[model samples]
Target chain A: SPGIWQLDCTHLEGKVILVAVHVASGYIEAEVIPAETGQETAYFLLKLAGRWPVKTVHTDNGSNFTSTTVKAACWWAGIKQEDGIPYNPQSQGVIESMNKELKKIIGQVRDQAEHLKTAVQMAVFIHNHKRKYSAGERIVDIIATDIQ
Target chain B: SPGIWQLDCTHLEGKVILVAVHVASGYIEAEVIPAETGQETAYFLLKLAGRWPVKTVHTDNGSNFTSTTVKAACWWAGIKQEDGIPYNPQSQGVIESMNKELKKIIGQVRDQAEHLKTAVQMAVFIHNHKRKYSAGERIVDIIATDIQ
Candidate 1:
């Protein structure tokens, strides 16, 4: 079932875009980086934590999530790094849907890589503040009182 | 009828948010300013033009639109400043609908004034590149060859 979650990993114009989505709230996040390195991946996780209360993370078996740097950062942040098998259909569907929404937003920019940073920032705001999910609440609203 | 139009004037947290919408393509531009002034209004017009080919503008009789500063700036930029009466429903409807959309995006940020700038930038991307109008084309696609 969908709950509060966020993940990252995408691309545009040769730049790697770290995309995250809050499963329960549908709050999306995008961070554009030069390359997909462990350092950048770990940094993005920390950044996502800054915005919302990240207790546990669920992602595929991608290297970005399975890196030592990411594990270290997660440990430091107290985030539970969890993953499912390659055939984790329900779990996998969460990220696939997220990337679709994110890429469409990226493709819409019609600008270049430099503009993508701003695009993600906008995506974060839109997903968190405006776009509503089945819960009938904004991501900020849900996370604000989601002390569970 | 709707056309390639953009206008600005909104508020949040006691700050003015200049919101402009490309009527022809639904491309929005939001600029949060410390206050509403001709200087800021004029500056925003130029900024909108920089992003899209702004040839004509339609607005109400607000001071921001009626100021000499704005007129002079419009003159400098070769933009035509067009206004409708108080009851210009068809034209007024364009901006009214736009502000409604823009304000929702602003309301979603759940942050502060500083973040509103990013919200507007995101609004522009969502409205222009991702949003499809009756013409079944993105704002960038329509404007790219809209030599008329």
Candidate 2:
């Protein structure tokens, strides 16, 4: 299951936040303000695709994600960037889970300074590599087959 | 009964120190950087005996305590100074109990740092106010007696 599309987005602060997830590998990536606008998302896409071979990249209607730099990055890497149907949670489960997982780690580290860094890294690392079974089989393992 | 001794003491920090105790009430006086001669012993005996009217003084055999200075102090105070047998525990029970009591409170503070200050203050305050028999019947009273 793979598709690509441009995203239109605006950031409250000057720096852009990039959120991406690999559907098959069950890996999630989030970048904070590496650069402004499409350039940052483009750089992110290039870096992500270099690490994992993927056919599809998904985005929301955000301009930052849909910018020329990001589209160029997907085209150069031969990866498609697709957008989900408006307000349909069913199609974008991976991205939603990625956001939840990241925010939860952040929330837990809110008051604890010394433990914040290690806790966030540990949470994300465990979420991807760890297996969860829904119905019959490992969903992540099944997803991993596409990457394989 | 009052037991007094000239103490040959080295500080825990390896400096010379002199400690004096009141024969009548459990009060302590300490001096750091004391004189090397037996003069301090004489001075201590004069002061303590004048205040409390001690009849007998028990001491360990330190040269200062045994020297002419101490003998003179005892003689002036109208008291006899008894040297404790080198290794025997028979001579000084009251002073030993006082030492143990003081140390126990200090030890609690040294080990438990969190509540150390509050706890030791409580211990010391309790010790001073709680009546212990010293030359009279043991009763819970803070009143001092005037003897002719």
Candidate 3:
């Protein structure tokens, strides 16, 4: 489906980033979290839902995903929650791959003068703008098509 | 076959928890991180290595796991680095399962007045002390055997 698939966190030199990926578009949204909490998880979803329509979110069975606060927030937002198998990341392949690629790109940009946050944003921009899928289409194009 | 695993940060209600699992011991250690970063990831490993003998460390292809800083620290500490497949959590099944269970317990305790950090520690303590595998042996006993 053309919706958000998974959410994961990555650590950089001195930062923790919360990332979400769109399945069809490969479009990613990330934010630097001051702390990892259910509230932060809910806030991230709220912002993501504001920017794009979130029909369903599939993620591993992490507490952040199962906490009552986050669940209620998703429920209020009309978002369905799909928890993956206990020890399977492949079930959330799209987001997992995005997390891997995002880390690599972020690492490469770590030495740059640009702030890590900006670097992450730029990396996501490049990923959506240029990364092509097996269908010979860019993620940005796919997302645009879906939106239209 | 026994080795140390990497800790990842997971958000609860208002806390960030760092969790690691030992393969043979099924021993899990977790702490609340005020900030999640590569530095914290390294610190967690250092603390773990101090408490238990660490010969090898396995983790997925997350940047923090692969970063030069962490690799250098591990090398200096005489620990081999084993990176699992990019999107395969099953490769690190021990730690992934621990993370899953840890979150469940933490979720249940979220409403209590006890600090989330203390709750997480208590959860890990109970997990290691009483949790048994298909073999019907407590993780604590397994770890004790390994240490001896």
Q: lDDT by residue for model 2 over B86-118, one digit each (tens)?
A: 455542676566656655754654443233333
Candidate 2 Cα outliers beyond 4 Å, as residue runs: A2-17, A34-36, A86-88, A91-98, A109-120, A133-148, B1-148
The model with the greater lDDT, 1 or 2, is 1
Ranking by DockQ: 1, 3, 2
Worst 10 residues of 3 chain A by lDDT: A134-143
- Find the 10 residues in a row with the least total lDDT in model 1 chain B: B128-137
Ranking under lDDT, best-scoring first? 3, 1, 2
TM-score of each: 0.45, 0.36, 0.43
Model 3: per-residue Cα lDDT over B12-123, one tens digit each: 7665787766666555667788866666666556545533446777753478766876675566456787765535556456556667888887676556424676467546
Interface RMSD, candidate 1?
16.4
By descending TM-score, how would the candidates be arranged? 1, 3, 2
Candidate 2 docking: what grade? incorrect
lDDT for every model?
A: 0.58, 0.46, 0.59
Winning candidate number (DockQ)? 1
Summed backbone clashes in each candidate are: 4, 15, 1
Candidate 3 residue-pair clash tally: 1
Best-fitting candidate, scored by TM-score: 1
Point out the higher-scoring one by DockQ: 1 or 2: 1
What CA RMSD would you report for each candidate? 13.9, 32.5, 20.5
lDDT string for model 2 (A15-115, tens) is 34454544443445444563456655665565444333446766655674468766776775677777645555654564555566666764664353233
